[PDB]
Design a protein around this ligand. Structure first.
Ligand SMILES: [Zn+2]
Ligand SMILES: [Zn+2]
Ligand SMILES: [Zn+2]
Lengths: 65, 266, 45, 134, 114
């Protein structure tokens, strides 16, 4: 769907981490673990919140209506 | 000062790593719970939706709205709507905010929590402004729009407690650790060959004295020192989560005292 | 009575009964109703 | 959490852990018999049209169908239809007795015989309750 | 669908007193207070502090069912010492530690950077 606004585990503000994540990846060629660390996602719960997430919205917008 | 004792090790906008000497276990615990579930906050708790031709469902959005951290610094001078005398909500117990978004571009239009617009009368109180720790200034990605897509809705933020919903947490994660050499034997370490070589050393071991095999078990000892770290979402600065925590705990201990006097009447 | 936004097309056809299918300029049937006015609320929970 | 049950973090649930959308589609159609016989989509009135449901029809617009905003619940009528038998007999479609939710979309189209027919689809979000299998 | 509302954890109901005090019929000079709309946050704190008072013979709390925000505190005191006072001194004692804790934290905070 879309980046959960808060991690379930503890509920850390991650909703504002998505774009910044995708940039760290592709823009400056970082690896997801490093990328996730630079976003200050330390504890592994809120960490998997981003890594394991799938952006199905990009697909949903594809439909005209 | 006198009893319980604090010692900051690290401090920041978002974290307070400290050491809480000379306190009961019970109290140092009860404080962490209160810090999680009982310091009040403002958060969106009603969404009237005018138009949503967006890819997402109404309530699915409504939901994320609830999760967006709103400034709750001056929260103590906002009221519980349940307490307010006004019918439904008012400008003295609820912030109202507006969200308008329409996709103009060919490119995907994003909707951030920056796009939230306060509308009700804050009347000076430092309240309701979406927290933005984002680097480019648009914290939290509410939604995404295609070309002709619109989303028009109105959110009434209320004072709430995390006990009632985890949105109203200022909390996040509270680190917590005592007796980093098991000198109290509060665990029995599972091992295969060697407890010591297999279990890694807690960072809080540079702070205490390792036991001596030349020593026997100190059985009289109690849990005394406590190594916490409070992290804050941001709807309340860090220092305040701990303070208001101590405040609230104390506050509710008190209503028990008062309640005992209320009963004494004939 | 009442207005029906075309499906595969974008519009606000307000046709009624005995007008029957389908749409305007589109040619295809399949009409979706349009959102109500009497707005609903959501607990944000 | 004994005997293949489990304990779920109520707090993390609120953050939206294991939440689902739930869409149900109801469907009805104008008669299938006669040359001077045709069931009609309308909001009937209990006057001489007796044989109605327990639930309110009050959420039915004039054409006999709800609008894609209205919350429905209990035995709310969702599709209004009368079968004119010689004033009328009711043939309206109540929202499932045990369900409740908000109308998502209403599809009015004709069928291959030139029959007007309708597809109403309701939406509930379902949050992990005590007793839900995982 | 069968869930209780969530305010029901901290909001009292239709005539539910906060405390309820009942004479324990087992041991003499003992009492069992019921705390509606509270939990381990409060109970564990009151019990642990009651166990520092050296005229308290017995002190323990318990949540009889997690469905419900409520708990029972059982208190026995030495002859002559009324248990309610044992509760009162107990609460106050906590409040004083908490206050000291708050100020001690504040001064520490006011010395930092970043
Ligand atoms: Zn987390
Ligand atoms: Zn009010
Ligand atoms: Zn069209």
């Amino acid at each position: 769907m879309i980046v959960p606004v808060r991690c379930f585990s503890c509920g850390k503000v991650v909703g504002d981490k998505w774009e910044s994540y995708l940039n760290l990846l592709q823009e400056d060629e970082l690896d997801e673990g490093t990328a996730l660390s630079r976003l200050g996602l330390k504890r592994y719960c809120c960490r998997r919140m981003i890594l394991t997430h799938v952006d199905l919205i990009e697909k949903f917008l594809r439909y005209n209506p | 000062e006198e009893g319980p004792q604090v010692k900051i090790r690290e401090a920041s906008k978002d974290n307070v790593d400290f050491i809480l000497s000379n306190v009961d276990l019970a109290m140092a615990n009860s404080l962490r719970r209160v810090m999680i579930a009982e310091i009040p906050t403002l958060a969106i708790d009603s969404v009237e939706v005018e138009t949503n031709t967006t890819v997402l469902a109404d309530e699915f959005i409504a939901h994320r709205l609830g999760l967006i951290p709103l400034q709750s610094m001056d929260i103590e001078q906002l009221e519980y709507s349940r307490d307010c005398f006004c019918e439904d909500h008012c400008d003295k117990c609820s912030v109202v905010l507006t969200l308008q978004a329409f996709g103009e571009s060919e490119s995907t239009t994003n909707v951030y929590s920056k796009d939230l617009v306060i509308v009700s009368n804050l009347m000076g109180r430092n309240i309701g402004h979406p927290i933005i720790q984002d680097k480019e200034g648009n914290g939290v990605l509410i939604c995404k729009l295609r070309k002709g897509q619109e989303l028009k809705l109105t959110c009434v933020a209320k004072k709430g407690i995390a006990k009632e919903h985890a949105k109203w947490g200022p909390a996040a994660a509270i680190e917590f650790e005592y007796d980093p050499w098991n000198k109290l034997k509060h665990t029995d370490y599972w091992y295969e060959q060697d407890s010591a070589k297999e279990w890694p050393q807690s960072k809080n071991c540079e702070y205490e004295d390792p036991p001596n095999e030349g020593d026997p078990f100190d059985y009289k000892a109690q849990a005394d020192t406590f190594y916490m770290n409070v992290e804050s979402v941001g709807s309340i600065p860090v220092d305040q989560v701990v303070v208001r925590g101590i405040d609230t705990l104390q506050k509710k201990v008190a209503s028990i005292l008062l309640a005992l006097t209320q009963m004494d009447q004939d | 009575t009442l207005k029906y936004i075309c499906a595969e097309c974008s519009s606000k056809l307000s046709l009624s009964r005995t007008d029957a299918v389908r749409c305007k300029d589109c040619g295809h049937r399949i009409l979706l109703k349009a959102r109500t006015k009497r707005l609903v609320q959501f607990e944000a929970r | 959490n004994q005997e293949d049950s489990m304990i779920m973090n109520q707090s993390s649930i609120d953050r939206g852990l294991f939440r689902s959308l739930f869409f149900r589609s109801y469907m009805d159609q104008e008669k299938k018999y006669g040359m001077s016989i045709t069931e009609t989509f309308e909001k009937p009135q209990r006057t001489n049209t007796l044989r109605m449901k327990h639930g309110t029809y009050d959420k039915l617009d004039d054409d006999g169908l709800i609008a894609p905003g209205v919350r429905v619940s209990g035995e709310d009528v969702i599709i209004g239809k009368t079968t004119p038998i010689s004033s009328k007999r009711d043939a309206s479609t109540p929202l499932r007795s045990t369900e409740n939710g908000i109308v998502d979309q209403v599809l009015v189209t004709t069928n291959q015989d030139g029959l007007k027919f309708v597809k109403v689809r309701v939406r509930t979000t379902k949050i992990p309750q005590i007793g839900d299998k995982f | 669908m069968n869930a209780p509302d969530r305010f029901e954890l901290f909001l009292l109901g239709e005539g539910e007193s906060k405390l309820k005090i009942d004479p324990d019929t087992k041991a003499p000079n003992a009492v069992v207070i019921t705390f509606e709309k509270e939990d381990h946050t409060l109970g564990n704190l009151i019990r642990a502090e009651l166990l520092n008072d050296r005229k308290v013979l017995f002190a323990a709390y318990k949540v009889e069912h997690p469905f419900f925000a409520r708990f029972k505190l059982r208190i026995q005191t030495t002859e002559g010492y009324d248990p309610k006072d044992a509760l009162k001194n107990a609460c106050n004692s906590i409040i004083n530690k908490l206050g000291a804790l708050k100020t001690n934290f504040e001064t520490e905070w006011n010395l930092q950077t970043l």
